[PDB]
Design a protein around this ligand. Structure first.
Ligand SMILES: [Pt+2]
Length: 255
């Protein structure tokens, strides 16, 4: 069953496994009034004749859109291998720069909500062959990125049906702000809420309180703790490996 600890080699390049391509892109953001960078993972065999689902994967504080790839996440390798094992269908993974800083910006990480929704998503949808409905859009991330996944995803259930916060940081909104309707929309529209963290992580308390709220308010979700896990990729990689499969099972890649 899932979630579970991944098998050795899940994150290593395997001989004979088709590799997707990671491309660097830039887009104009009305949120920052500047050109912003991002990376896009195109699955092996990517073709404009078919539509793909999209996962927006967010990095941590001070990080970049490279963190989830050669920065330690190895997201492309993990995805490549899962596709080859028939555990997930191909999908596009977008890694943005989560600090939408700019002129007169109070909080760049908060400003990122507008950047993602009004600039990045529209750019991706007009430049790649993808579905544009909530049932084919997921959001996940680590630390500050996990906090943004909670924040953006739960307050925009009309746009995301799968949410995966890993080791969510303090920027995570209070429970009342994440579920202003007592969890009505979450129970009926959210296909997957995957919360994961290492037990040795100092920030464990944030995902923990969201989990406690979901239990008390009967909100279905998956809470997974990696025993002895720290604030590092030895927790974030297994988190992604599991999220990809669970989101796929939940319908993320449904035709
Ligand atoms: Pt922070």
């Amino acid at each position: 069953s899932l979630p579970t600890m991944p098998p050795s080699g899940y994150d290593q390049v395997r001989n004979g496994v088709p590799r997707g391509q990671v491309v660097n892109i830039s887009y104009f953001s009305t949120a920052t009034n500047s050109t912003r960078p991002a990376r896009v993972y195109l699955p092996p065999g990517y073709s404009k004749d078919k539509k793909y689902s999209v996962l927006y994967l967010l990095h941590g504080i001070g990080g970049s859109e490279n963190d989830w790839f050669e920065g330690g996440g190895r997201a492309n390798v993990i995805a490549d291998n899962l596709i080859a094992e028939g555990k997930i269908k191909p999908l596009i993974i977008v890694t943005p720069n989560t600090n939408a800083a700019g002129p007169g910006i109070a909080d760049g990480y908060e400003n990122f909500t507008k950047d993602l929704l009004n600039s990045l998503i529209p750019y991706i949808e007009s430049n790649y062959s993808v579905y544009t409905d909530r049932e084919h859009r997921a959001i996940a991330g680590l630390s500050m990125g996990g906090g943004q996944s909670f924040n953006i995803g739960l307050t925009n259930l009309d746009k995301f049906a799968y949410i995966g916060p890993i080791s969510a940081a303090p920027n995570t909104y209070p429970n009342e702000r994440l579920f202003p309707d007592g969890g009505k929309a979450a129970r009926e529209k959210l296909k997957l809420l995957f919360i994961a963290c290492g037990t040795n992580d100092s920030l464990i308390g944030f995902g923990q309180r969201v989990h406690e709220y979901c239990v008390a308010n009967n909100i279905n979700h998956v809470y997974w703790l990696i025993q002895g896990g720290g604030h590092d990729f030895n927790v974030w990689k297994p988190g992604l490996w599991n999220f990809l499969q669970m989101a796929d099972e939940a319908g993320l890649t449904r035709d």
